[PDB]
Amino acid sequence: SFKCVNSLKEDHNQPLFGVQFNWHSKEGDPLVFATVGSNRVTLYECHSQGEIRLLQSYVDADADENFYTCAWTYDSNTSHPLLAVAGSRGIIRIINPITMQCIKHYVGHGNAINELKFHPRDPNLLLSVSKDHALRLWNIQTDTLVAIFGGVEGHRDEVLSADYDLLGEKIMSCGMDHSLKLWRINSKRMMNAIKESYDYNPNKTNRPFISQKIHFPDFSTRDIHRNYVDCVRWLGDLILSKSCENAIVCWKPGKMEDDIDKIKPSESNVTILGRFDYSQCDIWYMRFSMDFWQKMLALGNQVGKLYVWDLEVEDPHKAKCTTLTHHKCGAAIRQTSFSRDSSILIAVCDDASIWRWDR
């Protein structure tokens, strides 16, 4: 299936911590992905014969910025794609990918941002997770902080990853405190807060926009992993998460037959539905990705090996693994990304290299 068709290296020689294909490409335009590393974001276009065409970068004013993460959305009025980036400065930048202008930025975390994710039905709802232990939900249409997910019952150390479920009714987050926490955003309070955030125009009122303080997860566990949890993804109602213990665990809150929407905050059980082991991934901040349909899952390890799991099987534990190696690919792979149509997989590395694999 996948064959390695090209690679390159970016000129800064620092880790590429993130990669994302733009899944909002217009019909008939070439496939495009963004990489983030050092103080820059760079866009590339995929062409035939494995060509990876360099386009243009956004380079931060601060030489000490270090971007960690990026996420694509689009402008909800014009349809044009937008790219959000963030990293150690704790500043979210919204980038026009065509000109690479910083259209606007958001501050509040003040503290490093480890991940950004956009809501799967509302292109304006951006979630950030921070070294300051909180998540924040932003509305990038009205430029409002809708809610802060924190408090002593929230995360007690850096939050490293988070994912919305299929309809963006709830969020699972995870971090350095070894726990995975659920935060429901379809509550009456949260739905109202979002609606109010769309009604907010500071030119038409005197009040500041009030943010929700959400201090209580809807479920919490520390029973899945025994070290920093660095990546989490919903799979329907189940969860896929990993730590730096050479495993992705597939699990769910509660007991085997418990409905996710009936789980109470005080739920003390989880169910393990399978575990996908692999090797040489004991460093933290190593993220897996899935294709658009959630048929497959790719993870790179710290010596440049790729694992891909076929999840198109009746139960999670029946996943079929294949691996992808190249003799010149030896640096740690921080993240992978599939093109929308699943024909291309990209891996980015700690030595600033980019690896292209075609189906």
């Binding site: 880790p15 920093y228 460093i283 933290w284 740690a332």
Partner: peptide, 5 residues
Amino acid sequence: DFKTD
């Protein structure tokens, strides 16, 4: 736990 090798 190391972020890097």
